[PDB]
Design an enzyme around this catalytic site. Structure first.
Site, mmCIF file in Angstrom:
data_model
loop_
_atom_site.group_PDB
_atom_site.id
_atom_site.type_symbol
_atom_site.label_atom_id
_atom_site.label_comp_id
_atom_site.label_asym_id
_atom_site.label_seq_id
_atom_site.Cartn_x
_atom_site.Cartn_y
_atom_site.Cartn_z
ATOM 1 N N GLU A 1 44.544 38.482 42.005
ATOM 2 C CA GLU A 1 43.396 39.348 41.973
ATOM 3 C C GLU A 1 43.711 40.395 40.908
ATOM 4 O OE1 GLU A 1 42.951 41.733 45.486
ATOM 5 O OE2 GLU A 1 40.761 41.674 45.425
ATOM 6 N N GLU B 1 34.377 50.477 43.713
ATOM 7 C CA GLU B 1 35.098 50.383 44.972
ATOM 8 C C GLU B 1 35.359 51.783 45.514
ATOM 9 O OE1 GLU B 1 38.097 47.272 44.175
ATOM 10 O OE2 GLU B 1 39.239 48.183 45.855
#
Length: 219
Positions: free
Chosen positions: A113, A201
């Site tokens: 990721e 985020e």
């Protein structure tokens, strides 16, 4: 064109104008929304300044996990955004390029990721790393282990790759392929490109990310 999280549904994902969208909120409280614009553009808002409040909104281009991320000769991302954190309960947020390298079928290659962090508030991931020059700017690069849910399933231990921009900004050009090449130059394993997304985020924070320009492309 508007999707809400935190009162009934805590996730929405789909596609529009050829670009993915996803918005997600954990079950720990808070609320949030994403309004779609044309192309890959979007406005995201979150109010999750609560204990373990956890929010994300992202849009991007799916690459289908077809080939090594560094086999693409050139990947560009141009963006412009207004990005503001308006509350923080010992929290943080970031604006970054985001995606995965899929290792399914790939021997000796980690699941990754990745993050190319252009701006952040209060906190950003860090570790012993290396400074590199990409698009005329300094980025710190590093990798670290993470244990958690994954594009392939639930809790496993995988890798995260990071480039963290030293001079924060909310607009510009990113040569995504150059970040991938720098990571590869460290000897880090590179699997198949899953996606290239712009991602907002929030952890224990509230804010807004109004992305008025977002283009992702290969050549």
């Amino acid at each position: 064109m508007k999707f809400t999280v935190g009162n009934g549904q805590n996730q929405h994902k789909g596609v529009n104008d050829g670009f993915s969208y996803e918005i997600w909120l954990d079950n720990t409280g808070g609320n949030g929304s994403m309004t779609l614009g044309s192309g890959a553009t979007f406005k995201a808002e979150w109010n999750a300044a609560v204990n373990r409040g956890n929010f994300l909104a992202r849009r991007g281009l799916d690459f289908g996990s077809q080939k090594k991320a560094t086999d693409y000769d050139y990947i560009g991302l141009d963006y412009a955004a207004t990005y503001k954190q308006t509350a923080s309960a010992s929290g943080n947020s970031r604006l970054c390029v985001y995606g995965w390298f899929q290792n399914r079928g790939l021997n000796g290659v980690p699941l990754v990721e990745y993050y190319i962090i252009e701006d952040w508030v209060d906190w950003v991931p860090d570790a012993q790393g290396k400074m590199v020059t990409i698009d005329g700017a300094q980025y710190k690069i590093f990798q670290m282990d993470h244990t958690g849910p994954t594009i392939n399933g639930g809790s496993e231990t995988f890798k995260q790759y990071f480039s963290v921009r030293q001079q924060k900004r909310t607009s510009g050009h990113i040569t995504v392929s150059d970040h991938f090449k720098e990571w590869a130059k460290q000897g880090w394993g590179i699997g198949n490109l899953y996606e290239v997304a712009l991602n907002a985020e929030g952890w224990q924070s509230s804010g807004v990310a109004d992305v008025t320009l977002l283009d992702v492309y290969t050549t």
